[PDB]
Write a protein that binds this ligand. Structure first.
Ligand code: MG
Ligand code: NA
Length: 354
């Protein structure tokens, strides 16, 4: 039996010269054992869901701030930094954004002048969303995910831009406007990130690189790249991770690791173990070596890396379980963190605290 999380050395303290140590949270976890782990180990949080666009403006002019406020309030009381996730995304985003003034989907419109008008309306709505959220949280947020996942996994067009509805209506202008608007309202000191997953692998990595270089050339205000780091034990390689961060640092950008989790499985996640208890120790050891190498690399890059956030606290709550089930007939358990479902440490903890 391993010790409780609150009887071991603080992760935040261990890395205080290098980077913040963060966790994604839900409002209901901000007390009890999760609250205790959070206060002991972390100096940054992010909302797993409560600050996504649908979570804040489910219908036009109707803003739902409670869950988000609870998280901001907890960060404040416990002296934690706060990443904002996220101003722009193609999921968890309200349908009303993308209807013309006659209530029809803007994508269906074929008249060129009406399409132009729909583009302008959508960008107007985006600016209003951003302006309202920023005015409310600018004094609490220390990093903004201004856009999330705007780069494709394939090459449907030459720039590798995800062809979501945002793209279909505005091309790349939604991305421009999101940064310009965020900078305008949050001030020159705000830290503005473009966030994505598989930032370590090609061609995606290159599309993202080109996008940011293009945008920086046009004077669009991007301060850094958020590497979600939804990774596995052997993939991507340590070198792939390094190369990516070094590339973005070469453009004068900061890096943050934003949603770190180290799956026990590959992709797709199968065969998955059906319960936590069924998971054999070898998996936790292999994960511990992986974590050791990750955080040695992070430390090596700490001049160009300001924050590392895990996409959760302890192994009792992780979006990876949803994915494990989805590919194992509704049954499966992943275990991505350095803390177990009971908030006792796992082998990976010892290997990143030394
Ligand atoms: Mg170590
Ligand atoms: Na740093």
């Amino acid at each position: 039996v391993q010790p409780w999380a609150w009887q071991v050395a603080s992760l935040a303290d261990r890395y205080e010269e290098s980077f913040d140590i963060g966790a994604a949270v839900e409002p209901h976890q901000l007390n009890g054992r999760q609250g205790k782990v959070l206060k002991h180990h972390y100096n940054s949080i992010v909302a797993e869901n409560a600050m996504k666009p649908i979570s804040l403006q489910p219908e036009e002019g109707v803003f739902t701030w409670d869950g988000a406020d609870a998280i901001v309030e907890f960060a404040r009381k416990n002296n934690m930094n706060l990443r904002f996730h996220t101003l722009v995304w193609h999921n968890q985003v309200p349908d009303w954004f993308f209807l013309d003034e006659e209530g029809n989907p803007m994508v269906e419109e074929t008249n060129e002048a009406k399409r132009q008008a729909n583009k302008e309306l959508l960008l107007e709505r985006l600016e209003t969303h951003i302006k309202t959220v920023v005015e409310r949280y600018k004094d609490d947020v220390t990093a903004w995910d201004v856009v999330n996942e705007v780069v494709d996994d394939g090459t449907p067009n030459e720039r590798g831009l995800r062809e979501s509805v945002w793209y279909q209506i505005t091309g790349d202008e939604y991305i421009r406007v999101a940064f310009e608007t965020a900078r305008k309202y949050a001030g020159e000191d705000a830290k503005l990130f473009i966030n994505d997953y598989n930032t370590e692998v090609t061609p995606k990595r290159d599309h993202l690189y080109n996008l940011v270089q293009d945008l920086l050339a046009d004077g669009v205000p991007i301060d850094g790249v958020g590497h979600q780091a939804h990774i596995q034990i052997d993939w991507p390689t340590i070198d792939e991770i390094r190369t990516s961060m070094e590339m973005f640092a070469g453009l004068g950008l900061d890096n943050q690791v934003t949603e770190l989790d180290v799956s026990l499985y590959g992709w797709p996640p199968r065969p998955a173990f059906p319960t936590y208890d069924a998971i054999p120790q070898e998996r936790f050891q292999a994960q511990a070596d992986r974590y050791n190498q990750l955080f040695e690399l992070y430390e090596e890059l700490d001049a160009d890396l300001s924050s590392v956030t895990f996409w959760g606290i302890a192994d009792n709550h992780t979006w990876l379980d949803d994915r494990a089930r989805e590919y194992n007939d509704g049954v499966g358990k992943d275990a991505p963190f350095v803390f177990d479902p009971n908030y006792r440490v796992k082998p990976a903890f010892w290997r990143i605290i030394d």
